[PDB]
Amino acid sequence: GSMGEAPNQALLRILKETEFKKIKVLGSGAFGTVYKGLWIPEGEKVKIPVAIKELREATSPKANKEILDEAYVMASVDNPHVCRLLGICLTSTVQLITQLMPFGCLLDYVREHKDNIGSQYLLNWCVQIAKGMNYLEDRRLVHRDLAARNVLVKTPQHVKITDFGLAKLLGAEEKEYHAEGGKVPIKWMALESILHRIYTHQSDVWSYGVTVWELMTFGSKPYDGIPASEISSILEKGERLPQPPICTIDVYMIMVKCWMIDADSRPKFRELIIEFSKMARDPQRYLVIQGDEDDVVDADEYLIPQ
Ligand SMILES: CCC(=O)Nc1ccc(OC)c(Nc2ncc(Cl)c(-c3c[nH]c4ccccc34)n2)c1
Ligand code: NA
Numbered sequence: 263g264s265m266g267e268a269p270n271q272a273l274l275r276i277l278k279e280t281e282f283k284k285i286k287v288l289g290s291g292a293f294g295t296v297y298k299g300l301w302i303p304e305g306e307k308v309k310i311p312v313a314i315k316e317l318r319e320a321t322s323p324k325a326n327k328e329i330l331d332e333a334y335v336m337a338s339v340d341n342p343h344v345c346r347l348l349g350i351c352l353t354s355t356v357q358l359i360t361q362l363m364p365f366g367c368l369l370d371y372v373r374e375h376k377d378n379i380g381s382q383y384l385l386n387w388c389v390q391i392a393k394g395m396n397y398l399e400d401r402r403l404v405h406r407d408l409a410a411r412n413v414l415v416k417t418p419q420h421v422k423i424t425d426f427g428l429a430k431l432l433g434a435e436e437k438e439y440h441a442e443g444g445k446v447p448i449k450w451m452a453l454e455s456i457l458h459r460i461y462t463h464q465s466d467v468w469s470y471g472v473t474v475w476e477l478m479t480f481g482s483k484p485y486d487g488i489p490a491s492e493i494s495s496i497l498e499k500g501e502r503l504p505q506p507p508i509c510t511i512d513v514y515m516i517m518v519k520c521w522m523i524d525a526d527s528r529p530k531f532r533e534l535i536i537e538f539s540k541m542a543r544d545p546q547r548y549l550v551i552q553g554d555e556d557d558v559v560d561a562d563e564y565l566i567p568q
Contacts, residue, residue: 265434272337275349277301277359282351284314288366293427294318294325298362301348311362312348317427322355328427329356335426336360339401343394345414345424360424361416368421369410373481380554381508381545387413387421388474388538389563394423395470396531399463400568402432404439406461408469409450410476430461438462448490449483454525456494464525470534471520478506478513478549497521508549513541532565539563 282301289296294317301310317332319325329350336347336358351357365371368387372379391413398405406428414424428446430439441459452468454460472484484503485493502521505514516537522528529537536559541548546555 263435267434270338274333274337275347277349277351278304279351279353279357282312282314282359288313292318299359301359310348311364313360313362314351315358315360316353316355317358318355325355329358332426332429333358335403335429335431339398339403339426341394341397342420343390343422344397345422363414363416363422363424365415365418367411367424368413368415369476369481371415371418372410372477376480377553379480379551381549381551382542382555383418384477384549385538385542385545386419387477389535389542390421391423391470391473392531392534392538393565395466396535396565398423398429399466399531402434402436404430404432404461404463405466405469406430406439407447407450408466408473409447410473410481413473448493449485452525453494453497453523456497462525463531464528467520467525467528467531467534470531471517472503474520475503475506475517478509508551510548510550513548532567535563535565 281303282299284297284299286298287295288298294315297314297316299312299314301312302308303310315329317325317329319328333347333350333356336345340346345360345363348359348361351359391408395405395408405423405426407425408423412423412425414422416422432439439461441461446455448456450469450472452465455465455468475484476482485496488496502518505511516529516534519527519529539559540557
């Protein structure tokens with residue numbers, strides 16, 4: 263309890279609204295709306311595809327608060343497996359501008375390409391998502407909303423984590439974030455998060471296991487048919503998501519470890535990177551898929567806290 267805080271010198275970039283045009287709606291609902299768009303900086307021979315996020319809440323001040331908190335976090339992160347803020351645009355309700363991810367979210371992707379998705383892809387996605395989370399952990403960020411819908415696809419070989427609407431920054435030696443009231447997706451949440459509103463890097467790991475389960479089932483809904491109010495008592499009873507058909511015990515065991523009652527018994531993201539990348543060297547030994555396609559680890563898969 264002696265470490266202080268370093269200054270955050272991230273630049274917040276404010277973009278002119280005239281420099282980009284909307285093209286079509288990509289998605290919308292309660293959260294707000296996301297548009298596909300093209301950004302054309304003033305004195306340059308460049309056109310950049312972007313997503314334009316317009317969050318919607320009860321009032322404009324409410325939306326603007328939430329959206330500026332999200333811009334803070336996204337402006338502070340820079341990793342190949344995490345979405346990056348290009349900047350914000352100061353309309354009546356603020357717009358978040360980010361890179362367009364042309365293949366959409368990973369959840370819809372695995373649903374739409376179920377039949378042409380092999381073991382190599384699935385396992386590398388798991389590696390890449392873990393690399394993203396591990397980086398976020400090194401930035402002392404708890405994501406709190408990791409799910410297949412919140413993983414975006416730049417290319418089938420390259421995915422990035424998105425949606426920092428619920429993300430929280432921990433203090434220097436701080437371990438937990440205690441949430442107030444507020445909707446959070448119960449079916450991706452760790453038990454302690456549901457019971458006590460405690461969120462940690464290890465509660466993010468629980469969400470990761472559920473995200474991997476989504477991928478391995480080719481985009482099934484977790485605990486399908488079950489109402490959210492019944493979930494915590496199910497988990498308290500020791501019940502968990504079932505073993506996906508394509509999964510070997512080796513892979514299913516990793517998921518179960520992510521869903522341990524004891525948060526500190528769950529794997530660390532750095533360990534998941536190692537485990538999944540080892541598996542990715544021999545994909546068909548670990549996933550058994552219809553119509554598919556040394557202990558040595560590369561230093562880029564051996565990540566040490568920063
Ligand atoms: C799971 C649903 C899904 O993401 N669809 C989807 C389809 C097609 C796309 O590209 C042509 C994309 N590209 C994309 N690029 C950047 C962002 Cl920041 C978002 C994005 C963030 N939040 C969202 C909520 C709803 C829709 C999109 C987003 N999307 C996304
Ligand atoms: Na392994």
